[PDB]
Amino acid sequence: WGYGKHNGPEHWHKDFPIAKGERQSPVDIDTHTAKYDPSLKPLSVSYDQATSLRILNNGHAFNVEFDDSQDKAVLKGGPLDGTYRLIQFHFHWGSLDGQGSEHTVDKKKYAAELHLVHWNTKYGDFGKAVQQPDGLAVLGIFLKVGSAKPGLQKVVDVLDSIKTKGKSADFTNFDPRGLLPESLDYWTYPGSLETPPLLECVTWIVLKEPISVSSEQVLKFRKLNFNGEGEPEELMVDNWRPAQPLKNRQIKASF
Ligand SMILES: [Zn+2]
């Protein structure tokens, strides 16, 4: 599976039949249809004690990994029940500034999209969590092109070392707090993993407020390779999945 003509999202259902399931992600967030839900509590992000370990190129994106052996970086509150630990964060971006985001707002597409992956500690590990309806919590953040993002530069400066599939680099002391918008206003709905195996185990939390990154920041992303070292170069671009059918589900707003 990949993001090309022959192995793109339109092909994933052949190996992962859930691809045409009832709670697939991403989706288009229709802001006039979204329901303001007064019973929605504020989001609770505790990342001051976060421990990053490494960054890797898995062939479809780059993952910044965190030590999830203790409740060091967690998300709670909002529409969530219990504590969710931060495991990794990654992005989805386009070939141009005009596309890249997975989720869309009133059909508007952003340059990229930041996903912070968290798992429900009631289930013991990530592996067990992907087997549950409430096993994951993904915090989605939109990126627009404008001014540079100080907090993202450390990520950008190490991409050169993990250019090809399989590469990894020690990456400690990185604070995720540098990637959050000022407002924590969000939209929430029940969905799924955006990549195979596309398990319908996610509680999506998409922030209203996007973060801005400079054109040169985003440019560095576009220089990665899908392919492994010593293979024809396939730039890592357009690694985003098209919006899926809402199918009855309801998107609620904390605002
Ligand atoms: Zn993602």
State how far the Cα of 201 lies from the Cα of 137, in Å rounded to an integer: 8
Burial of 11 by CB count in 10 Å (0-12 exposed, 13-18 middle, 19+ buried)?
middle
In the DSSP assignment, the letter for residue 208 is S
Q: Which residues surround ligand 1, an ion (CB under 5 A)?
A: 115, 194
The token pair that represents 108 in the structure block? 């508007």
196 HSE (CA, 13 A, CB side): 15
β-pair type (52-57, 74-77): unpaired
For 19, 23, 91, 134, 161, the CA distances from 243, given in Å and listed in that order, are 12, 12, 16, 21, 32
118 CA distance to ligand 1 centroid (A)? 12
d(CA 208, CA 188): 10
Q: Count H helices, E strands: the chain?
A: 3, 15
CA 144 to chain centroid: 15
Rounded alpha-carbon distances, angstroms, from residue 223 to 61, 92, 185, 220: 12, 13, 32, 5
CATH superfamily of the domain spanning 1-255? Alpha carbonic anhydrase (3.10.200.10)
Render 30-62 in DSSP notation, one character per residue: -TTTSEE-TTPPPEEEE-TT--EEEEEE-SSSE
For residue 201, how far is its CA from the centre of ligand 1 (angstroms)? 14
Dihedral class, residue 140 (left if φ above 0, else alpha if ψ from -120 to 50, else beta): beta
CA distance 5 to 95: 15
Active site residue 60: yes
Nearest CA to 10 among 1, 115, 238?
A: 1
Bridge partners of 44?
76
| Distance in angstroms (rounded) separating the CA atoms of residues 30 and 25 | 14
Q: Please, what sign has the CA dihedral across residues 206, 208, 213, 219? A: positive
Alpha helices in the chain, H assignment, sequence order:
126-129, 153-158, 215-221
**Residues facing 212 on adjacent strands:** 144
Task: Give 143 Cα–ligand 1 centroid separation in angstroms.
Answer: 13
Helix runs in 171-243, H state only: 215-221
As given in the structure block, the two tokens for residue 254 are 């904390």
Among 157, 135, 136, which residue's Cα sits nearest to residue 148?
Answer: 157
* Phi, psi (deg, nearest 5) at residue 222: -65, -5
Cβ neighbors of 146 (< 8 A, separation 6 or more) are 212, 213, 214
Rounded to the nearest angstrom, the distance between the alpha carbon of 167 and the centre of ligand 1 is: 19
Tell me the β-bridge partners of 134: none
Structure-determination technique: X-ray
Query: CA 35, 201, 74 angle in degrees (round to 5)?
Result: 85
Which of 60, 90, 92, 115 is catalytic? The answer is 60
Phi first, then psi: what are they for 3, rounded to 5°?
Answer: -125, 20
Say how many Å lie between the CA of residue 32 and the centre of ligand 1: 25
Nearest in space to 191 (alpha carbons), one of 234, 133, 141, 140: 133
Compute, in angstroms, the gap from residue 101 CA to the centroid of ligand 1. 9
